Amino acid sequence: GLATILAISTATPPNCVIQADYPDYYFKITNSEHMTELKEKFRRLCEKSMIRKRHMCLTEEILKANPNMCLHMGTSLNARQDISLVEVPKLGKEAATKAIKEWGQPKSKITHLIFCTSAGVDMPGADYQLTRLLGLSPEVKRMMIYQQGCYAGATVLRLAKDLTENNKGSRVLIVCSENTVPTFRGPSDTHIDSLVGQALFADGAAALIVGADPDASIERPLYHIVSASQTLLPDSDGAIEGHIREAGLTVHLKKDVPAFFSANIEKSLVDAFTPIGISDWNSIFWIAHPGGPAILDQVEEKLGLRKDKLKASRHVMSEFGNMSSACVLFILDEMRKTCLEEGKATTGEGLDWGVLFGFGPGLTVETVVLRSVPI
Amino acid sequence: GLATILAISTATPPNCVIQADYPDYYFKITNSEHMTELKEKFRRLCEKSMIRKRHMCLTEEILKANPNMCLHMGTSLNARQDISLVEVPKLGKEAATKAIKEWGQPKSKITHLIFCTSAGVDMPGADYQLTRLLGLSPEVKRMMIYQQGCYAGATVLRLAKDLTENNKGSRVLIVCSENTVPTFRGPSDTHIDSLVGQALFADGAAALIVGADPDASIERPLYHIVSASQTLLPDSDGAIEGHIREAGLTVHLKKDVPAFFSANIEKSLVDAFTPIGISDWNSIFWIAHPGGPAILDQVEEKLGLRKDKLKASRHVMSEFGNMSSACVLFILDEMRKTCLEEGKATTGEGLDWGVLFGFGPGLTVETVVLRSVPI
């Protein structure tokens, strides 16, 4: 049968930054209060973000201890790696233990592990660290998805679908764990596009169990993964780039990203849903990577979505910020919980069919067709 | 049906270094001729490497233009990335075009792309670059496997097996492209394990087409991918580590690494071949990642392999050195070419079943069971 999501959980670092207070904090800790016009631009970005709070393992204490991270382009990759490479699997384990609990099986039944992060590469990778931290079988079949950015929450579902459907009895643990350690940096009027990241990026981890052929005596499906596609957008090359450099991960925006995603998203919908016979985009539930707020606004306008279609996606953005690959997985967690609390008929806001979108560098759109389960 | 390898090709940079001359060249270009004790240790390492030559895109001209790369721990990641991120997909495209030719189908029939490298991370990744360089369909389903080291040539086969067997009609292009740009550095008596890498690592790219259900009117299988396993070796934590730092990729080795692999290899063989009813390791053909030559020697001795079992693996090591993930794929290409040239009965040295091993950080062993095809 089809790959099925059997459990979801999440974790965030305990320190959280209130967005209303962030322009003042960020310009203070980076010693940039003299850049008054830049501070005003950053305040506007923070207020436009529709983020209320973000969780960050980067604290004032840590930044004071790593002052090269507070420069715009300080030589700082080593300092960033030293923090992030430990944090990434630690936060991932926090989510994974809880997903395993919901799943209801012993962890010795996990046959496959997908780990996903853009927060720092190491050899061996975070997949190895998580395997040892959790005490998974040494024979777990691992896939380490590094540096794929904000569409990778859909990528891991696409990968998990083929792994679990091609291997009878297989059960995949998926962990996505992201943080701002590689990207945090001081401001510069050269690199205004970096301020976008400073206003949006946040920390979080999400874990899932995916498997085909559920054991109804123990396992409880949440969503079915029907199809998974990936495409590059025409003429979009260079719109979003992220470079791993001596100063950490630097972000570069060169084209109108929301215009590209909104102009092309209907093609992905038609390709995904024509085989199903669906053409009304308000008749399906939506999980859309929300880390670019203007992207969601323009998708909504272009397609004529009702204002509530993206409610769960915008709620996660409001409460957590742009956690990169983890966002869409937080959104699935939020949707099923809200549907249960509100007495909706399915885990997809009472609807049967749904779409999950990852958006990221390429420009790339990942399109996952889901089906809900009854509540 | 089973996933099958339908085509293989390879590519190397034109510049090559003769191993017998390398100690003198390396110590001169790194301005380290005064480290006379270290130079003799390096000559012994090169003499014991059983490498005759290695291809390298890093030329004398480039090293003279990038002097911080010739220091031992010079701040040089940016210079390395500037070189490697263009070289990786360029060399990969060279191999991919030739693999596509052998396959015999138009490149519009490629539905999936797996790209693998440890030579430098970027967003978007080398998979995106290769897709654009080759003019693949924008809807190609990509998987980017970054920084998994020397076992990843087997990893890509494990991944391709699930992708192609779960998707009717799918055809996956696999590209592995590796180089010494991130690891090349001057010598130091505080980091002797780095010398091992300077004696062994080399550049190369290999490309494959993999698919299930071949069309016998156009396609010609070379190998069948029967099973693919991965395991961590007991109590091997920290034996091989690779860190991505301001000075590039730095390598760190405990000294009993060959002992770990040779002492555990039989478990991987028993686990893979018991379902097939095979216990005689001389009755199967071998593709063993050859990048540690004591690994090959100790495996041969521990298992009592015939003197010629590792012939193709040692030949690739001799002519190309340790090209990380690409080695095992060069070895498959060498085996089928030599079998045809020499009138063998199958693409597996006249034998029917074979094993392909990837070895790398973890410590990880990847075990792929293959079947040959008649010639």
Automatic annotation (TrEMBL), chains A, B:
It catalyses: N-methylanthraniloyl-CoA + 3 malonyl-CoA + 3 H(+) = 1,3-dihydroxy-N-methylacridone + 3 CO2 + 4 CoA + H2O. The modification Cysteine sulfenic acid (-SOH) is found at residue 57. One of its GO terms (molecular function) is acridone synthase activity. InterPro entries: Chalcone/stilbene_synt_C, Chalcone/stilbene_synt_N, Chalcone/stilbene_synthase_AS, Polyketide_synthase_type-III, Thiolase-like. Residues 225-374 form the Chalcone/stilbene synthase C-terminal domain. The modification Cysteine sulfinic acid (-SO2H) is found at residue 150. It comes from the Eukaryota. CoA binds at residues 41, 253, 291, 294. Residues 1-214 form the Chalcone/stilbene synthase N-terminal domain. The keyword Acyltransferase applies. PROSITE patterns: CHALCONE_SYNTH (PS00441). The active site is at 150 (acyl-thioester intermediate). Keywords: Acyltransferase, Transferase. One of its GO terms (biological process) is polyketide biosynthetic process. One of its GO terms (cellular component) is endoplasmic reticulum. Belongs to the thiolase-like superfamily. Chalcone/stilbene synthases family. PANTHER family: CHALCONE SYNTHASE, HYDROXYMETHYLGLUTARYL-COA SYNTHASE. This is Type III polyketide synthase. The lineage of its organism: Eukaryota, Viridiplantae, Streptophyta, Embryophyta, Tracheophyta.
